[PDB]
Design a protein around this ligand. Structure first.
Ligand SMILES: Nc1cncc(C(=O)Nc2cccc3ccccc23)c1
Ligand SMILES: [Cl-]
Ligand SMILES: [Cl-]
Ligand SMILES: [Zn+2]
Length: 313
């Protein structure tokens, strides 16, 4: 007694298989998943005929397909992706003010604010798996995209996460080759040092949330033991992300694109998203509120950019 099924690593290229209904999937394919569910220890049902099963990339055809689709050789990746998808397919993805959000479940507030942010900044993903899942997420079906983020970041469903680190890992799998930043550091004692940064380093800054303040100059400790002024000379990027240790901060309508708020103690707090549109909207998973100004413990602020050159001489 047999059925025909298909095996895959990318859910695009299918491989025809005939399975024995008296043996487990595990006995025939090794670790096997059906829409994220682990079916390794399960025997084929009638209802399985014609269905697609994920298997591990254990031969050269599957390794080429999996590497071209996911751009990772981590042998646990597909198992972690499937384990996460079994949960994320049960999350809800409401449209909030025209953006795909996530209804709160499993400590996912960092993923909701990351997903909302990605829909507001120009970013192209390198791995086809992320490109395809991101397109589906923007259309409202974000389960695959959320499970890929989890898998790529080595996070499990239910784990508390960091928005900044999550964005940094996603930026590392994105095309930021065009991104350039020139900084100047001026110490009235030591003199001045210019630095040029590329890629992820060109779009992320830690120590101030204010892009305006970064342009005017921020005070930092100099290696000589005094204080220096660091300021932005030149920026070439479609956005910048400014971060700082969480502190009470006032967001003003029309001065930024979006921001992350973190409330609570070390590690086990909660994120909300603030987006500047016609007014300020606070998106907290499924929840939406508005205000003319917003003051809270802000961690990350995103700004639109294209090309900036300082007037500072
Ligand atoms: N998501 C989250 C939750 N709870 C605590 C943090 C936190 O403090 N992380 C950081 C560690 C080290 C240096 C940091 C410097 C700046 C900002 C955060 C830092 C982050
Ligand atoms: Cl993309
Ligand atoms: Cl990549
Ligand atoms: Zn100095």
């Amino acid at each position: 007694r047999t059925i025909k099924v298909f095996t895959t690593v990318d859910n695009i290229n299918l491989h025809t298989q005939v399975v024995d209904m008296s043996m487990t999937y595990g006995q025939q394919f090794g670790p096997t998943y059906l829409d994220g569910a682990d079916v390794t220890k399960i025997k084929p049902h009638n209802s399985h005929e014609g269905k697609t099963f994920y298997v591990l990339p254990n031969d050269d055809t599957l390794r080429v397909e999996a590497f071209e689709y996911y751009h990772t050789t981590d042998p646990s990746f597909l198992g972690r992706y499937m384990s996460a998808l079994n949960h994320t397919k049960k999350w809800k993805y409401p449209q909030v003010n025209g953006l795909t959000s996530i209804k709160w479940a499993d400590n996912n507030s960092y993923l909701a604010t990351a997903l909302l942010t990605l829909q507001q900044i120009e970013l192209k993903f390198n791995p086809p798996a992320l490109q395809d899942a991101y397109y589906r997420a923007r259309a409202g079906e974000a389960a695959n995209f959320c499970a890929l983020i989890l898998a790529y970041c080595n996070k499990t469903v239910g784990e508390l996460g960091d928005v900044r680190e999550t964005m940094s890992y996603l930026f590392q799998h994105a095309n930021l080759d065009s991104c350039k930043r020139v900084l100047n550091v001026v110490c009235k004692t030591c003199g001045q040092q210019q630095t040029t940064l590329k890629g992820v380093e060109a779009v992320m800054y830690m120590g101030t949330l204010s892009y305006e303040q970064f342009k005017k100059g921020v005070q930092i400790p100099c290696t000589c033991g005094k204080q220096a002024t660091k300021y932005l000379v030149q920026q070439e990027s479609p956005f910048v992300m400014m971060s700082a240790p969480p502190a009470q901060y006032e967001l003003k309508h029309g001065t930024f694109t979006c921001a992350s708020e973190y409330t609570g103690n070390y590690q086990c707090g909660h994120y909300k998203h603030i987006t500047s549109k016609e007014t300020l909207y606070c998106i907290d998973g499924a929840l939406l509120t508005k205000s003319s100004e917003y003051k809270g413990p802000i961690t990350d602020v995103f700004y639109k950019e294209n090309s900036y050159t300082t007037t500072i001489k």
